[PDB]
């Protein structure tokens, strides 16, 4: 049966398996497609890489406002663009 090998995780996957890959300071959502050539598809469209962290859609977090001296609350939206929102709290 057909497999993919991911050199970043070091693991072997079956077609349709989904997993996380650490690459270029980000976490990618990957899927083993195979297609006769161990084809893997990886995306960061559905994650929010803010502040050096990696969040999933619906995650919320807090981060300091640069200069204001208060915190922000942020929410990961994704929208196919790795997009998030922040507001003062």
């Amino acid at each position: 049966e057909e497999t993919c090998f991911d050199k970043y995780t070091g693991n072997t996957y079956r077609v349709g398996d989904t997993y996380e890959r650490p690459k270029d300071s980000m976490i990618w959502d990957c899927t083993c497609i195979g297609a006769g050539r161990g084809r893997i598809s990886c995306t960061i469209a559905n994650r929010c890489h803010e502040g050096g962290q990696s969040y999933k859609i619906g995650d919320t977090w807090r981060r300091p406002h640069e200069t204001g001296g208060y915190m922000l609350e942020c929410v990961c939206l994704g929208n196919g663009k790795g997009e998030w929102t922040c507001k003062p709290i």
């Binding site: 161990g38 084809r39 893997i40 598809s41 990886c42 196919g80």
Partner: peptide, 14 residues
């Protein structure tokens, strides 16, 4: 720059 939000990889021809 982040020009695209995904990539595709497959086995090298060699």
């Amino acid at each position: 720059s982040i020009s695209y939000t995904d990539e595709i990889e497959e086995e090298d021809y060699d």
